[model samples]
Target: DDAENIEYKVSISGTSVELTCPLDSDENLKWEKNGQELPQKHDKHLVLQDFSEVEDSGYYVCYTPASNKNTYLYLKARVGSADDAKKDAAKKDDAKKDDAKKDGSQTNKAKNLVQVDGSRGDGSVLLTCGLTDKTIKWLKDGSIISPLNATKNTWNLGNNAKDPRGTYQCQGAKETSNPLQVYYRM
Candidate 1:
Protein backbone atom coordinates (compact mmCIF):
# COMPACT_ATOMS: atom_id res chain seq x y z
CA ASP A 1 0.00 0.00 0.00
CA ASP A 2 2.79 2.43 0.93
CA ALA A 3 4.79 1.64 -2.20
CA GLU A 4 1.78 1.92 -4.47
CA ASN A 5 1.10 5.47 -3.37
CA ILE A 6 4.52 6.80 -4.47
CA GLU A 7 5.86 7.37 -7.98
CA TYR A 8 9.18 8.73 -9.33
CA LYS A 9 11.46 8.92 -12.37
CA VAL A 10 15.21 9.42 -12.74
CA SER A 11 17.94 10.12 -15.31
CA ILE A 12 21.71 10.24 -14.93
CA SER A 13 24.80 11.59 -16.64
CA GLY A 14 28.49 10.84 -16.26
CA THR A 15 28.85 12.12 -12.73
CA SER A 16 25.80 14.24 -12.07
CA VAL A 17 22.03 14.06 -11.88
CA GLU A 18 19.01 16.28 -11.20
CA LEU A 19 16.08 15.21 -9.06
CA THR A 20 12.61 16.71 -8.80
CA CYS A 21 9.95 16.15 -6.19
CA PRO A 22 6.59 17.77 -5.42
CA LEU A 23 6.66 17.87 -1.63
CA ASP A 24 8.01 20.84 0.27
CA SER A 25 9.47 21.24 3.81
CA ASP A 26 6.15 20.81 5.52
CA GLU A 27 6.48 17.08 4.95
CA ASN A 28 8.93 14.92 6.86
CA LEU A 29 11.49 13.88 4.28
CA LYS A 30 13.84 10.96 3.79
CA TRP A 31 15.72 9.80 0.71
CA GLU A 32 16.98 6.41 -0.36
CA LYS A 33 18.94 4.91 -3.20
CA ASN A 34 18.54 1.20 -3.97
CA GLY A 35 17.08 0.47 -0.57
CA GLN A 36 19.88 2.20 1.34
CA GLU A 37 19.52 5.52 3.14
CA LEU A 38 21.11 8.59 1.60
CA PRO A 39 22.77 10.74 4.21
CA GLN A 40 21.51 14.28 4.56
CA LYS A 41 24.02 16.99 3.80
CA HIS A 42 24.36 20.22 5.75
CA ASP A 43 22.06 22.04 3.34
CA LYS A 44 19.19 19.73 4.26
CA HIS A 45 19.28 18.51 0.70
CA LEU A 46 19.86 14.88 -0.12
CA VAL A 47 22.58 14.73 -2.72
CA LEU A 48 24.03 11.84 -4.67
CA GLN A 49 27.53 12.87 -5.64
CA ASP A 50 30.66 11.62 -7.42
CA PHE A 51 28.46 9.46 -9.64
CA SER A 52 29.99 7.44 -12.46
CA GLU A 53 28.95 5.22 -15.39
CA VAL A 54 29.34 1.65 -14.17
CA GLU A 55 27.44 1.13 -10.90
CA ASP A 56 25.92 4.33 -9.58
CA SER A 57 22.77 4.33 -11.63
CA GLY A 58 19.85 2.89 -9.74
CA TYR A 59 16.50 3.49 -8.13
CA TYR A 60 16.02 6.39 -5.69
CA VAL A 61 13.11 7.47 -3.53
CA CYS A 62 12.08 10.51 -1.52
CA TYR A 63 9.90 9.46 1.43
CA THR A 64 7.68 11.82 3.36
CA PRO A 65 6.13 11.02 6.71
CA ALA A 66 3.18 13.03 8.01
CA SER A 67 0.84 10.91 10.03
CA ASN A 68 -2.83 11.14 9.00
CA LYS A 69 -1.76 13.50 6.21
CA ASN A 70 -0.98 12.95 2.53
CA THR A 71 2.61 11.75 2.58
CA TYR A 72 3.47 11.40 -1.09
CA LEU A 73 5.47 13.19 -3.77
CA TYR A 74 6.58 12.66 -7.36
CA LEU A 75 10.27 12.48 -8.32
CA LYS A 76 12.17 12.74 -11.59
CA ALA A 77 15.79 13.04 -12.78
CA ARG A 78 17.57 13.52 -16.11
CA VAL A 79 21.01 12.26 -17.02
CA GLY A 80 23.11 13.50 -19.94
CA SER A 81 26.09 12.14 -21.77
CA ALA A 82 29.73 13.26 -21.94
CA ASP A 83 29.43 13.98 -25.66
CA ASP A 84 26.50 16.31 -25.04
CA ALA A 85 27.84 17.12 -21.58
CA LYS A 86 29.55 20.16 -23.01
CA LYS A 87 26.21 21.46 -24.21
CA ASP A 88 24.64 21.09 -20.77
CA ALA A 89 27.77 22.59 -19.29
CA ALA A 90 27.64 25.52 -21.65
CA LYS A 91 24.02 26.12 -20.72
CA LYS A 92 24.94 26.27 -17.04
CA ASP A 93 27.59 28.88 -17.86
CA ASP A 94 24.93 30.76 -19.77
CA ALA A 95 22.57 30.75 -16.81
CA LYS A 96 25.18 32.50 -14.69
CA LYS A 97 25.72 35.26 -17.21
CA ASP A 98 22.04 35.87 -17.61
CA ASP A 99 21.56 36.25 -13.87
CA ALA A 100 24.60 38.50 -13.57
CA LYS A 101 23.41 40.84 -16.29
CA LYS A 102 19.92 41.11 -14.85
CA ASP A 103 21.44 42.03 -11.50
CA GLY A 104 23.49 44.83 -13.15
CA SER A 105 26.89 43.11 -13.53
CA GLN A 106 27.51 43.43 -17.27
CA THR A 107 31.02 42.07 -17.61
CA ASN A 108 32.01 40.46 -20.95
CA LYS A 109 32.81 37.25 -19.14
CA ALA A 110 29.43 37.43 -17.50
CA LYS A 111 27.76 37.69 -20.88
CA ASN A 112 29.73 34.71 -22.13
CA LEU A 113 28.69 32.64 -19.16
CA VAL A 114 25.00 32.95 -19.97
CA GLN A 115 24.84 29.86 -22.19
CA VAL A 116 21.57 28.53 -20.86
CA ASP A 117 18.43 30.57 -21.49
CA GLY A 118 16.57 30.06 -18.21
CA SER A 119 17.27 30.54 -14.52
CA ARG A 120 15.25 29.27 -11.57
CA GLY A 121 15.24 32.58 -9.78
CA ASP A 122 17.36 35.47 -8.49
CA GLY A 123 19.46 33.31 -6.20
CA SER A 124 20.27 30.58 -8.72
CA VAL A 125 23.92 30.41 -9.80
CA LEU A 126 25.62 27.54 -11.62
CA LEU A 127 29.11 26.71 -10.32
CA THR A 128 31.42 23.91 -11.43
CA CYS A 129 33.07 22.08 -8.56
CA GLY A 130 35.74 19.61 -9.78
CA LEU A 131 36.87 19.76 -13.37
CA THR A 132 39.77 17.47 -14.22
CA ASP A 133 43.01 19.01 -12.87
CA LYS A 134 41.85 22.57 -12.37
CA THR A 135 41.15 24.41 -9.13
CA ILE A 136 38.01 26.57 -9.11
CA LYS A 137 37.06 29.59 -7.02
CA TRP A 138 33.79 31.57 -6.90
CA LEU A 139 33.98 35.35 -7.02
CA LYS A 140 31.25 37.82 -6.32
CA ASP A 141 32.15 40.81 -8.45
CA GLY A 142 35.76 39.56 -8.28
CA SER A 143 35.82 38.79 -4.56
CA ILE A 144 36.18 35.17 -3.41
CA ILE A 145 33.21 33.81 -1.46
CA SER A 146 34.53 30.27 -0.97
CA PRO A 147 36.29 29.81 2.36
CA LEU A 148 40.09 29.98 2.56
CA ASN A 149 40.47 26.37 3.63
CA ALA A 150 38.95 25.32 0.31
CA THR A 151 41.64 24.04 -2.00
CA LYS A 152 42.04 25.33 -5.51
CA ASN A 153 40.95 21.97 -7.00
CA THR A 154 37.46 21.99 -5.46
CA TRP A 155 35.02 24.67 -4.34
CA ASN A 156 31.52 24.32 -3.00
CA LEU A 157 29.27 27.38 -2.78
CA GLY A 158 26.26 26.66 -0.68
CA ASN A 159 22.72 27.58 -1.76
CA ASN A 160 21.74 31.16 -2.46
CA ALA A 161 22.45 33.68 0.22
CA LYS A 162 19.95 36.24 1.53
CA ASP A 163 21.79 39.23 0.08
CA PRO A 164 20.07 40.84 -2.91
CA ARG A 165 23.40 41.89 -4.39
CA GLY A 166 24.75 38.34 -4.46
CA THR A 167 26.24 37.20 -7.78
CA TYR A 168 29.21 34.88 -8.41
CA GLN A 169 31.77 33.59 -10.92
CA CYS A 170 34.44 30.91 -10.81
CA GLN A 171 38.11 31.56 -11.58
CA GLY A 172 40.76 29.04 -12.47
CA ALA A 173 44.52 29.27 -12.11
CA LYS A 174 44.90 28.78 -15.86
CA GLU A 175 42.98 30.84 -18.39
CA THR A 176 42.64 27.87 -20.74
CA SER A 177 40.97 26.01 -17.90
CA ASN A 178 39.27 29.19 -16.81
CA PRO A 179 36.80 28.21 -14.18
CA LEU A 180 33.28 28.00 -15.59
CA GLN A 181 31.47 30.79 -13.77
CA VAL A 182 27.70 30.97 -13.24
CA TYR A 183 25.50 33.49 -11.47
CA TYR A 184 22.75 33.61 -8.89
CA ARG A 185 20.97 36.90 -8.30
CA MET A 186 19.58 38.15 -5.00
Candidate 2:
Protein backbone atom coordinates (compact mmCIF):
# COMPACT_ATOMS: atom_id res chain seq x y z
CA ASP A 1 0.00 0.00 0.00
CA ASP A 2 1.80 3.14 -1.19
CA ALA A 3 1.05 6.18 0.98
CA GLU A 4 -0.57 9.03 -0.97
CA ASN A 5 -1.82 11.38 1.81
CA ILE A 6 -5.30 9.78 2.04
CA GLU A 7 -7.38 10.41 5.17
CA TYR A 8 -9.03 7.67 7.21
CA LYS A 9 -12.35 7.52 9.06
CA VAL A 10 -13.10 4.82 11.62
CA SER A 11 -16.61 3.47 10.98
CA ILE A 12 -18.92 1.51 13.23
CA SER A 13 -22.32 -0.14 12.83
CA GLY A 14 -25.58 1.85 12.98
CA THR A 15 -23.77 5.15 12.51
CA SER A 16 -22.65 7.29 9.59
CA VAL A 17 -19.93 9.73 8.60
CA GLU A 18 -19.83 12.61 6.11
CA LEU A 19 -16.70 13.91 4.46
CA THR A 20 -16.08 16.86 2.12
CA CYS A 21 -13.73 17.13 -0.80
CA PRO A 22 -10.67 19.35 -0.38
CA LEU A 23 -10.52 20.73 -3.93
CA ASP A 24 -12.23 24.09 -4.65
CA SER A 25 -13.79 24.64 -8.10
CA ASP A 26 -16.95 26.03 -9.72
CA GLU A 27 -17.74 22.76 -11.54
CA ASN A 28 -19.92 19.98 -10.26
CA LEU A 29 -17.80 17.40 -8.40
CA LYS A 30 -17.88 13.61 -8.88
CA TRP A 31 -17.92 11.35 -5.82
CA GLU A 32 -17.13 7.65 -6.13
CA LYS A 33 -16.58 4.73 -3.79
CA ASN A 34 -14.05 2.37 -5.34
CA GLY A 35 -14.74 3.87 -8.82
CA GLN A 36 -18.53 3.66 -8.34
CA GLU A 37 -21.08 6.45 -7.86
CA LEU A 38 -21.40 7.62 -4.28
CA PRO A 39 -24.14 9.44 -2.39
CA GLN A 40 -23.65 13.07 -3.29
CA LYS A 41 -24.15 16.28 -1.38
CA HIS A 42 -23.91 19.99 -2.09
CA ASP A 43 -20.46 21.66 -1.87
CA LYS A 44 -18.69 18.43 -2.87
CA HIS A 45 -19.63 16.62 0.33
CA LEU A 46 -20.15 12.84 0.44
CA VAL A 47 -22.34 11.01 2.87
CA LEU A 48 -21.43 7.40 3.71
CA GLN A 49 -24.01 5.42 5.62
CA ASP A 50 -25.61 2.04 6.33
CA PHE A 51 -22.69 -0.13 7.34
CA SER A 52 -24.66 -3.34 7.92
CA GLU A 53 -22.22 -5.51 5.95
CA VAL A 54 -18.46 -5.85 5.43
CA GLU A 55 -18.86 -4.86 1.77
CA ASP A 56 -19.53 -1.24 2.78
CA SER A 57 -15.95 -0.60 3.79
CA GLY A 58 -13.92 0.58 0.82
CA TYR A 59 -11.66 3.26 -0.59
CA TYR A 60 -13.61 6.44 -1.45
CA VAL A 61 -12.68 9.51 -3.46
CA CYS A 62 -14.12 12.86 -4.51
CA TYR A 63 -13.05 14.21 -7.86
CA THR A 64 -13.20 17.64 -9.47
CA PRO A 65 -13.10 16.59 -13.12
CA ALA A 66 -12.56 20.04 -14.66
CA SER A 67 -9.54 20.73 -12.42
CA ASN A 68 -8.33 17.11 -12.47
CA LYS A 69 -7.88 17.10 -8.67
CA ASN A 70 -9.14 14.61 -6.10
CA THR A 71 -8.95 13.61 -2.44
CA TYR A 72 -9.34 10.12 -1.00
CA LEU A 73 -10.51 8.48 2.21
CA TYR A 74 -10.48 4.94 3.55
CA LEU A 75 -13.55 3.70 5.38
CA LYS A 76 -12.53 1.23 8.08
CA ALA A 77 -15.25 -0.57 10.02
CA ARG A 78 -15.13 -1.65 13.65
CA VAL A 79 -17.35 -3.47 16.15
CA GLY A 80 -18.66 -0.87 18.60
CA SER A 81 -20.76 2.22 17.96
CA ALA A 82 -18.98 5.47 18.85
CA ASP A 83 -22.23 7.30 19.58
CA ASP A 84 -23.40 4.49 21.88
CA ALA A 85 -20.18 4.61 23.85
CA LYS A 86 -20.39 8.41 24.07
CA LYS A 87 -24.02 8.40 25.20
CA ASP A 88 -23.35 5.68 27.78
CA ALA A 89 -20.53 7.65 29.34
CA ALA A 90 -22.61 10.81 29.40
CA LYS A 91 -25.47 9.03 31.14
CA LYS A 92 -23.18 7.32 33.64
CA ASP A 93 -21.53 10.59 34.66
CA ASP A 94 -24.84 12.39 35.26
CA ALA A 95 -26.26 9.42 37.20
CA LYS A 96 -23.15 9.20 39.37
CA LYS A 97 -23.37 12.91 40.16
CA ASP A 98 -26.99 12.60 41.29
CA ASP A 99 -26.27 9.52 43.44
CA ALA A 100 -23.28 11.16 45.07
CA LYS A 101 -25.35 14.24 45.87
CA LYS A 102 -28.07 12.02 47.31
CA ASP A 103 -25.64 10.26 49.62
CA GLY A 104 -24.06 13.54 50.70
CA SER A 105 -27.42 15.19 51.40
CA GLN A 106 -29.54 12.38 52.87
CA THR A 107 -27.10 10.34 54.97
CA ASN A 108 -25.13 11.25 58.11
CA LYS A 109 -26.13 14.90 58.23
CA ALA A 110 -24.40 17.30 60.58
CA LYS A 111 -24.39 20.92 61.79
CA ASN A 112 -20.92 22.10 60.74
CA LEU A 113 -20.59 25.79 61.67
CA VAL A 114 -19.17 28.12 59.07
CA GLN A 115 -16.06 30.26 59.38
CA VAL A 116 -17.01 33.93 59.03
CA ASP A 117 -14.33 36.21 57.58
CA GLY A 118 -13.90 39.94 56.78
CA SER A 119 -14.53 43.02 58.92
CA ARG A 120 -17.72 44.93 59.64
CA GLY A 121 -15.91 48.20 58.98
CA ASP A 122 -15.03 47.01 55.50
CA GLY A 123 -18.74 47.44 54.53
CA SER A 124 -18.79 43.80 53.33
CA VAL A 125 -18.63 40.31 54.80
CA LEU A 126 -17.34 37.00 53.43
CA LEU A 127 -18.22 33.60 54.90
CA THR A 128 -17.34 30.09 53.83
CA CYS A 129 -18.80 26.72 54.84
CA GLY A 130 -15.99 24.41 55.91
CA LEU A 131 -16.92 21.54 53.62
CA THR A 132 -14.81 20.03 50.83
CA ASP A 133 -16.06 20.78 47.29
CA LYS A 134 -19.55 21.87 48.33
CA THR A 135 -21.67 24.69 46.94
CA ILE A 136 -22.50 27.22 49.66
CA LYS A 137 -25.85 29.02 49.65
CA TRP A 138 -26.28 32.32 51.41
CA LEU A 139 -29.19 33.15 53.67
CA LYS A 140 -30.27 36.52 55.02
CA ASP A 141 -32.64 36.82 58.03
CA GLY A 142 -33.89 33.22 57.50
CA SER A 143 -34.38 33.78 53.75
CA ILE A 144 -32.39 32.12 51.00
CA ILE A 145 -30.67 34.47 48.53
CA SER A 146 -31.13 34.22 44.78
CA PRO A 147 -29.16 31.44 43.12
CA LEU A 148 -27.97 33.95 40.50
CA ASN A 149 -25.95 35.66 43.24
CA ALA A 150 -24.46 32.35 44.38
CA THR A 151 -21.63 31.48 42.02
CA LYS A 152 -18.82 30.46 44.37
CA ASN A 153 -17.97 28.49 47.50
CA THR A 154 -18.09 31.61 49.70
CA TRP A 155 -20.63 34.39 50.17
CA ASN A 156 -19.81 38.10 50.11
CA LEU A 157 -22.43 40.42 51.52
CA GLY A 158 -23.10 43.52 49.45
CA ASN A 159 -25.46 46.50 49.56
CA ASN A 160 -29.06 45.53 50.26
CA ALA A 161 -32.15 47.59 51.03
CA LYS A 162 -33.91 45.21 53.48
CA ASP A 163 -32.12 44.63 56.73
CA PRO A 164 -28.62 45.24 55.44
CA ARG A 165 -27.22 44.38 58.87
CA GLY A 166 -29.47 41.41 59.56
CA THR A 167 -28.29 38.03 60.81
CA TYR A 168 -26.49 36.17 58.00
CA GLN A 169 -26.16 32.41 57.56
CA CYS A 170 -25.02 29.95 54.93
CA GLN A 171 -26.26 26.55 53.80
CA GLY A 172 -23.86 24.22 52.07
CA ALA A 173 -24.63 21.09 50.09
CA LYS A 174 -24.83 18.95 53.26
CA GLU A 175 -24.51 21.39 56.15
CA THR A 176 -26.03 24.68 57.29
CA SER A 177 -23.71 27.25 58.83
CA ASN A 178 -24.58 29.04 62.06
CA PRO A 179 -26.09 32.53 62.09
CA LEU A 180 -23.57 35.32 62.68
CA GLN A 181 -25.01 38.59 63.91
CA VAL A 182 -23.45 41.80 62.65
CA TYR A 183 -24.14 45.48 62.10
CA TYR A 184 -23.58 47.46 58.90
CA ARG A 185 -23.37 51.25 58.76
CA MET A 186 -25.01 53.27 56.01
Candidate 3:
Protein backbone atom coordinates (compact mmCIF):
# COMPACT_ATOMS: atom_id res chain seq x y z
CA ASP A 1 0.00 0.00 0.00
CA ASP A 2 2.90 2.33 0.69
CA ALA A 3 4.37 1.53 -2.72
CA GLU A 4 2.16 4.09 -4.48
CA ASN A 5 2.54 7.85 -3.99
CA ILE A 6 0.15 10.73 -4.78
CA GLU A 7 0.69 14.00 -6.64
CA TYR A 8 -1.49 17.04 -7.24
CA LYS A 9 -1.30 20.07 -9.54
CA VAL A 10 -2.40 23.59 -8.50
CA SER A 11 -2.49 26.04 -11.41
CA ILE A 12 -4.34 29.09 -10.16
CA SER A 13 -3.76 32.18 -8.05
CA GLY A 14 -5.81 31.16 -5.01
CA THR A 15 -6.89 27.63 -4.01
CA SER A 16 -6.74 25.02 -1.31
CA VAL A 17 -5.06 21.59 -1.14
CA GLU A 18 -6.13 18.78 1.16
CA LEU A 19 -4.21 15.55 1.53
CA THR A 20 -5.25 12.41 3.35
CA CYS A 21 -2.72 10.06 4.89
CA PRO A 22 -2.89 6.64 3.23
CA LEU A 23 -3.27 4.72 6.42
CA ASP A 24 -5.89 2.09 7.24
CA SER A 25 -5.73 2.23 11.06
CA ASP A 26 -5.96 5.26 13.33
CA GLU A 27 -2.43 6.25 14.35
CA ASN A 28 -0.31 9.25 15.11
CA LEU A 29 0.55 10.96 11.81
CA LYS A 30 2.85 13.90 11.07
CA TRP A 31 3.03 16.32 8.13
CA GLU A 32 6.19 17.83 6.70
CA LYS A 33 6.86 20.39 3.96
CA ASN A 34 10.11 20.24 2.03
CA GLY A 35 11.66 17.90 4.68
CA GLN A 36 10.65 20.16 7.64
CA GLU A 37 7.98 18.93 10.05
CA LEU A 38 4.70 20.88 10.24
CA PRO A 39 1.93 21.11 12.80
CA GLN A 40 -0.88 18.65 12.19
CA LYS A 41 -4.00 20.52 11.07
CA HIS A 42 -6.29 17.44 11.30
CA ASP A 43 -6.06 13.90 12.51
CA LYS A 44 -6.81 12.24 9.14
CA HIS A 45 -5.82 14.87 6.59
CA LEU A 46 -3.52 17.86 6.16
CA VAL A 47 -5.16 21.09 5.02
CA LEU A 48 -3.20 23.61 2.89
CA GLN A 49 -5.48 26.64 2.94
CA ASP A 50 -5.39 29.84 0.82
CA PHE A 51 -2.53 29.01 -1.52
CA SER A 52 -0.26 31.82 -2.81
CA GLU A 53 2.65 32.15 -5.23
CA VAL A 54 5.37 32.64 -2.63
CA GLU A 55 4.63 30.56 0.45
CA ASP A 56 2.94 27.39 -0.83
CA SER A 57 5.08 26.19 -3.80
CA GLY A 58 7.00 23.09 -2.81
CA TYR A 59 6.67 19.46 -1.79
CA TYR A 60 4.48 18.22 1.06
CA VAL A 61 4.88 14.87 2.80
CA CYS A 62 2.67 13.11 5.31
CA TYR A 63 4.08 10.15 7.18
CA THR A 64 3.36 7.87 10.12
CA PRO A 65 6.20 7.09 12.48
CA ALA A 66 4.95 3.61 13.49
CA SER A 67 4.57 2.06 10.03
CA ASN A 68 6.96 4.38 8.13
CA LYS A 69 4.46 5.00 5.31
CA ASN A 70 4.57 8.34 3.49
CA THR A 71 2.25 10.22 1.16
CA TYR A 72 3.69 13.00 -1.01
CA LEU A 73 2.06 16.12 -2.44
CA TYR A 74 3.69 18.40 -4.99
CA LEU A 75 2.38 21.97 -5.54
CA LYS A 76 3.31 23.57 -8.84
CA ALA A 77 2.10 27.14 -9.35
CA ARG A 78 1.15 28.40 -12.81
CA VAL A 79 0.44 32.08 -12.28
CA GLY A 80 -0.86 34.31 -15.07
CA SER A 81 -3.13 37.31 -15.68
CA ALA A 82 -5.41 38.44 -18.50
CA ASP A 83 -3.43 41.62 -19.16
CA ASP A 84 -0.12 39.78 -19.60
CA ALA A 85 -1.77 37.15 -21.75
CA LYS A 86 -3.19 39.76 -24.13
CA LYS A 87 0.17 41.48 -24.52
CA ASP A 88 1.92 38.19 -25.34
CA ALA A 89 -0.67 37.41 -28.02
CA ALA A 90 -0.29 40.83 -29.61
CA LYS A 91 3.49 40.50 -29.78
CA LYS A 92 3.23 37.13 -31.50
CA ASP A 93 0.85 38.52 -34.12
CA ASP A 94 3.14 41.43 -34.95
CA ALA A 95 6.10 39.07 -35.41
CA LYS A 96 4.12 36.85 -37.76
CA LYS A 97 3.10 39.79 -39.97
CA ASP A 98 6.65 41.06 -40.25
CA ASP A 99 7.94 37.63 -41.21
CA ALA A 100 5.27 37.31 -43.91
CA LYS A 101 6.23 40.61 -45.52
CA LYS A 102 9.93 39.79 -45.54
CA ASP A 103 9.43 36.34 -46.93
CA GLY A 104 7.14 37.71 -49.64
CA SER A 105 9.81 40.04 -51.00
CA GLN A 106 12.57 37.42 -50.94
CA THR A 107 10.43 34.82 -52.63
CA ASN A 108 9.90 37.13 -55.61
CA LYS A 109 13.58 37.60 -56.39
CA ALA A 110 14.53 33.91 -55.99
CA LYS A 111 11.97 32.61 -58.45
CA ASN A 112 12.93 30.24 -61.27
CA LEU A 113 16.62 30.02 -60.43
CA VAL A 114 18.76 27.34 -58.83
CA GLN A 115 22.42 28.04 -58.10
CA VAL A 116 24.84 25.21 -57.46
CA ASP A 117 27.99 25.83 -55.45
CA GLY A 118 30.27 23.54 -57.52
CA SER A 119 30.59 21.99 -60.97
CA ARG A 120 28.67 18.94 -62.20
CA GLY A 121 31.79 16.73 -61.85
CA ASP A 122 32.26 17.55 -58.15
CA GLY A 123 31.74 14.81 -55.53
CA SER A 124 29.19 16.87 -53.61
CA VAL A 125 27.71 20.33 -53.98
CA LEU A 126 25.71 22.86 -52.02
CA LEU A 127 22.59 24.01 -53.88
CA THR A 128 21.09 27.37 -52.91
CA CYS A 129 18.02 28.71 -54.63
CA GLY A 130 16.18 31.12 -52.38
CA LEU A 131 16.47 33.63 -49.57
CA THR A 132 18.20 32.12 -46.55
CA ASP A 133 15.49 33.29 -44.15
CA LYS A 134 12.60 31.83 -46.11
CA THR A 135 11.48 28.22 -46.30
CA ILE A 136 12.65 26.19 -49.30
CA LYS A 137 11.66 22.79 -50.64
CA TRP A 138 13.91 20.46 -52.60
CA LEU A 139 12.71 18.01 -55.25
CA LYS A 140 14.34 15.35 -57.41
CA ASP A 141 12.68 14.48 -60.75
CA GLY A 142 9.48 16.30 -59.68
CA SER A 143 9.13 14.38 -56.40
CA ILE A 144 9.70 16.03 -53.03
CA ILE A 145 12.73 14.87 -51.09
CA SER A 146 12.66 13.94 -47.40
CA PRO A 147 14.91 14.56 -44.38
CA LEU A 148 15.05 18.29 -45.15
CA ASN A 149 13.94 20.48 -42.28
CA ALA A 150 11.99 22.75 -44.75
CA THR A 151 13.50 25.83 -43.10
CA LYS A 152 16.74 25.61 -45.00
CA ASN A 153 17.48 27.64 -48.15
CA THR A 154 20.13 25.21 -49.32
CA TRP A 155 20.37 21.50 -49.96
CA ASN A 156 23.47 19.35 -49.91
CA LEU A 157 23.64 16.84 -52.77
CA GLY A 158 25.50 14.22 -50.74
CA ASN A 159 25.35 10.48 -51.44
CA ASN A 160 22.76 11.23 -54.08
CA ALA A 161 25.68 12.29 -56.26
CA LYS A 162 26.43 8.59 -56.70
CA ASP A 163 22.85 7.43 -57.23
CA PRO A 164 21.77 8.61 -60.67
CA ARG A 165 21.88 11.46 -63.13
CA GLY A 166 18.71 13.47 -62.78
CA THR A 167 17.27 16.94 -62.36
CA TYR A 168 17.02 18.63 -58.93
CA GLN A 169 15.13 21.80 -58.15
CA CYS A 170 14.35 24.05 -55.19
CA GLN A 171 10.96 25.61 -54.62
CA GLY A 172 9.76 28.37 -52.38
CA ALA A 173 6.34 29.66 -51.37
CA LYS A 174 5.57 31.52 -54.61
CA GLU A 175 8.25 30.28 -56.98
CA THR A 176 10.14 27.19 -58.15
CA SER A 177 13.79 27.12 -59.24
CA ASN A 178 15.07 26.05 -62.63
CA PRO A 179 16.04 22.40 -62.79
CA LEU A 180 19.74 21.57 -62.50
CA GLN A 181 21.35 18.28 -63.39
CA VAL A 182 23.29 15.96 -61.06
CA TYR A 183 25.45 13.52 -63.01
CA TYR A 184 26.60 10.19 -61.59
CA ARG A 185 29.72 8.19 -62.35
CA MET A 186 28.95 5.28 -64.70
On TM-score, the leading prediction is: 2
Per-residue lDDT tens digits for candidate 1, residues 1-186, read 121211232233354554443344334566655435554422223444444423542334444555222212212223344322332432322111223325643223211221221223653323343334365555555556766454544444444342222233455554212223222221
**Model 2: which ten-residue window has the lowest total lDDT?**
88-97
Compute each candidate's TM-score over C-alphas.
0.28, 0.33, 0.32
Per-residue CA lDDT of model 2 for 1-186, tens digit only, reads: 122222322323246555545544235666666446654333444555655325653445555556453433433333336343442222322111122223444323332334443445754445555366467667765577754456466666563222234455556676654444333322
Evaluated with lDDT, which candidate comes out highest? 3
RMSD in Å for candidate 3, one decimal? 25.4
TM-score quality measure for candidate 1: 0.28
Estimate the Cα RMSD of every predicted model relative to the unseen true structure. 19.1, 26.6, 25.4
Better of 1 and 2 by lDDT: 2
Residue 96 CA displacement from its true place in model 1, Å: 30
TM-score between model 2 and native? 0.33
Alpha carbon lDDT at 177, candidate 1: 21
Residue-pair clashes per prediction, in order, are 12, 0, 0
How displaced is residue 81 in candidate 3, in Å? 14
lDDT of 1 at 118: 20
